[PDB]
């Protein structure tokens, strides 16, 4: 939270990346943006939560960088 939302978002990038997995899917973004904090705006961070997966969605998880860069984009810009 604050400027250290960067620490929090790489911290989820540690819990949901497991330890060495580096791929978090949409379901992980649900448990996240509910548990990791609580919620962000409402419909626009819904944009966060719905865009993480992808177009086909068979095995589209967001790995090393999208989850923090998206978290920095949505939080700080």
62 beta partners = 24
Q: Please, what's the b/e burial string for 51-73 (b: 16 or more CB within 10 A of its CB; e: otherwise)?
A: ebbeeeeeeebbeeebbbebbee
- Residue where the block lists tokens 């919620």: 39
| Residues in CB range of 40: below 8 A, 6 or more apart | 33, 48, 74, 75
Instruction: Report the SS3 class of residue 31.
Output: helix
Query: Rounded CA gap, 59 and 2, in Å?
Result: 32
Closest of 59, 30, 35, 56 to residue 45, by C-alpha = 30
Report the CATH number that the domain containing residue 75 is assigned in CATH. Answer: 1.10.238.10
Structural domain count of the chain = 1
Range 13-18, long-range pairs (CB < 8 A, 24+ positions): 13/64, 13/67, 13/68, 16/67, 17/63, 17/64
Query: Rounded CA gap, 66 and 38, in Å?
Result: 20
Assigned token pair, 71? 């978290």
Q: Which domain, by its residues, includes 77?
A: 1-77
């Amino acid at each position: 939270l604050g400027p250290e939302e960067k620490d929090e978002c790489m911290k989820i990038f540690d819990i949901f990346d497991r330890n060495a997995e580096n791929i978090a899917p949409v379901s992980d973004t649900m448990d996240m943006l509910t548990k990791l904090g609580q919620t962000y705006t409402k419909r626009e961070t819904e944009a966060i939560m719905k865009e993480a997966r992808g177009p086909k969605g068979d095995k589209k998880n967001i790995g090393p960088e999208e989850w923090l860069t998206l978290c920095s984009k949505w939080v700080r810009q």
